[PDB]
């Protein structure tokens, strides 16, 4: 008769766990998940001692403990570093055919993230590296799309360019940084894009290295 009691008192915990598992993966907030899991564990801790002897209660408590333990990897899986390519890599290595729009928290939960923590760590490491390279290229694009050549009037005849030191320092920094990015282990993904910017960067230098000269002599000759 105590089997009925433990099943009835564990049914509510099962409904809440399944309702959490049915949540789509996009809407998951891991901090709210930790709050709900902590509420569930504290609810389980209040059961009568007669029920606690059973193996089902121990199994469910261990299950929630495991979900708490892998909550760290769940947080890391909500990282913005992960992209479609990294989700594909996770699917291939873990041998699971997920659908990113249709993915639910329960499918990731029941997949043995605890056992497979090494694969998850490797994929998120690759994601971090590729995110670093991507945001570096984003910085290049923003800077050079927003860079304006300063001009200062010269004897009311024209406006000559000022700030050669800053321009050449920025060009040197970006060219050196792209050349160093070419050595990165995560470079193959962004390769083509990097090459494009390299060309433009070199052209920029190949212009202004001439331009300052064509300025200086002219100024001298003007004087």
């Amino acid at each position: 008769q105590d089997l009925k009691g433990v099943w009835s008192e564990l049914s509510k915990v099962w409904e809440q766990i399944d309702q959490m598992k049915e949540q789509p993966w996009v809407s998951v907030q891991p901090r709210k998940l930790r709050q709900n899991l902590d509420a569930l564990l504290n609810q389980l801790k209040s059961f009568p001692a007669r029920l606690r002897q059973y193996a089902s209660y121990e199994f469910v408590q261990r299950l929630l403990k495991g979900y708490m333990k892998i909550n760290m990897l769940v947080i890391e899986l909500k990282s913005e570093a992960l992209k479609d390519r990294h989700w594909k890599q996770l699917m291939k290595r873990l041998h699971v055919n997920w659908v990113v729009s249709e993915l639910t928290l329960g499918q990731i939960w029941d997949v043995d993230l605890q056992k497979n923590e090494a694969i998850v760590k490797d994929v998120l490491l690759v994601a971090q590296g590729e995110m670093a390279l991507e945001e570096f290229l984003k910085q290049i694009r923003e800077v050079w799309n927003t860079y304006e050549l300063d001009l200062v009037n010269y004897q009311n005849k024209c406006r000559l360019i000022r700030g050669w030191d800053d321009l050449f320092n920025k060009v040197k920094e970006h060219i050196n940084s792209v050349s160093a990015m070419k050595l990165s282990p995560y470079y193959k993904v962004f390769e083509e894009d990097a090459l494009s910017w390299e060309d433009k960067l070199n052209r920029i230098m190949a212009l202004f290295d001439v331009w300052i000269d064509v300025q200086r002599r002219w100024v001298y000759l003007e004087g």
Binding site: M131, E135, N176, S177, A180, L183, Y187
Partner: protein, 801 residues
Amino acid sequence: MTRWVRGIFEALRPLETLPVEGLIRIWAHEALRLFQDRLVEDEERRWTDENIDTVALKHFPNIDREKAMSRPILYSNWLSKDYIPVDQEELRDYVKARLKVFYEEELDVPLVLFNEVLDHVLRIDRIFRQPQGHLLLIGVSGAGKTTLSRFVAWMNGLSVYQIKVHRKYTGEDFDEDLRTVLRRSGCKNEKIAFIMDESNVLDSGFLERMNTLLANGEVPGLFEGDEYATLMTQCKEGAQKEGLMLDSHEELYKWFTSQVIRNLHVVFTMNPSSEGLKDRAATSPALFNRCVLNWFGDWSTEALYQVGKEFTSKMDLEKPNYIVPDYMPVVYDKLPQPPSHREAIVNSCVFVHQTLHQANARLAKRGGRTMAITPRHYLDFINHYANLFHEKRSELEEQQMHLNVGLRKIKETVDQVEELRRDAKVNRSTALLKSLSAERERWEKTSETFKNQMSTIAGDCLLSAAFIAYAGYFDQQMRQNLFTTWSHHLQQANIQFRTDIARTEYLSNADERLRWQASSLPADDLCTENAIMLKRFNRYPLIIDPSGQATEFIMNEYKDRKITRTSFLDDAFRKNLESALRFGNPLLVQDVESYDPVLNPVLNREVRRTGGRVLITLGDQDIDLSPSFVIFLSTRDPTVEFPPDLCSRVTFVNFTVTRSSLQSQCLNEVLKAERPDVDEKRSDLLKLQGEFQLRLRQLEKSLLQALNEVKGRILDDDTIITTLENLKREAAEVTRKVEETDIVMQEVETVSQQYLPLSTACSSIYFTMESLKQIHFLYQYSLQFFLDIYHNVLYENPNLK
């Protein structure tokens, strides 16, 4: 005194009523929190403890001391909505729960709560609750500052702001940063913990703009111009949000100043007064007066014991048969008694730190160059001990499982040959069986030995882990002295450890040593140990190499990873460092004698996680730490005194020739050149460790490969015993040498002491040649000169023919 009045006022403001004894208790608590924290020495704290009681009982007679002031005085606001006294255990439990939450929320690094860190948490929280509450945490490098401040700021919801000083970071940039944080704190009513560190407080010119903020909460002249109009608009918007209708600009500015007093806090973090080279020297006494000062100090024996127990609790350091010694040496007077194996192991782990501190003090006594020893050394030691324990136990378990599989397959082959005896091939099956069973018996005894190896693993890893963490800067002689001291202390505690441990052999396989020697590694005991330290490092290494061999070694080792050379003195250093940190290529930075402070967080691994973007501050920029990044700091100068700030952030690796190093090199050279038999018997004594047994069971691997490849064709000629005889020889051979491991050790000792005066003469001669510089500038001779002289004297000597 005004801080005292403010503290009692904030304590009493939410309280509806008090008794006199509660007032005395709050008075004593504020006395301790304002005066006892700044003190450095323990006895001064005891004097303050007694004097608070004396003054209270003098000016408040007939008030019983036990109720009015109990020694464990704590006031906190987390347990209850009111600022009332609370018990130690409840606060311990709450802070432990919140810290375990903090692990998986902002930064995933364990943080142990010991008796001397909960107090600092409470002090930091207290200064956060006061108005105009600015804290100045001063203490040894490491020890929790910049980690406890962030932790308490996270707990209390204060958004942490840290200044990012660049080069050409003029005072206007600091002015703008102060404007932004002041607007956030006052107009938007967002509490901020304004954390400042000595690294970015290198210039004292901007630290006198902050004094006005600390003393008054408003810095006039910041918002002059249209900024005044915008701030007035936002300030009146905020006042309307709070429900107060204000018109005059002066009253609005006063309310803004009051909000800045309430909200914005400043947390300075400094090291003790060793920054004489800095422009600060000892920073201005005005800065000390304005803030509330907190002496962090260094972890005591109890703190080391507790932070060791909770880091080595996941390890299986349990031995049911641990015979406690009759008389044990103890660093922790409050050890559980009779101590168990885990207790004894952690006490020995604290012995390591205590003996290293004593050794450094002794080296200071004899005028030698000392290096700062900090808590991060202990944390690195414990981490290395855990990783090494796990690695060695995993290796031994793998080998034991493989040998059990081999025994299973041997029994299967016995069954197969028994089936073949059911059937002139049959007669010689009596021989193969006579081989097979013997092999089986051999493997059985091998399995037994593995059990003994289990019983010896723990202490061994300890004696190696400390060596990887602590004794990296010291010379070879003091390295051996420290190792002997640690081994003797382990022996005293009945912890089982190998008698004749070889550090360089226990921590590296022969393939790795061969690879290093293929690279530009001078093959010496000190150099091999240093090369191991460049493999098993948690913190990035500092390579002190006057010869310059180690830089080439690092370059050749990491050539596949496209390591690039840089120096601090190079103009294009910061950008190269940015690229290396951003993309993950390894880096070698030379001339760290002029150590830039911008590398302080990078060595400390102060990652700030925001979504998938893992930022680290460098100058103006916040750059993305790639996983692959590794940095090696280098020094051609062997005469350098690094700051204690850098010592805790880096592990030292000394490639410096000394008396004992050259003595050992010369002695090994003579033993190789003139008594090569003893050289063989010495290299064979360091090959009775992993090398020979690894080969012996790697032959069992090929045996088992060619043992179950059977379909009744095992008796092709009944001559498979050859493959089983090739293992019959070597086993007995490596059973002879294991038996002849005391005769050989004594023999090499006796033969090496004979050739020792030559080695001492060699060391003295070379160091005299090095001394020749200060007689005349031309009298400069490399160590290659002396070694070439010795090669001529040993090998190309016509008098020896």
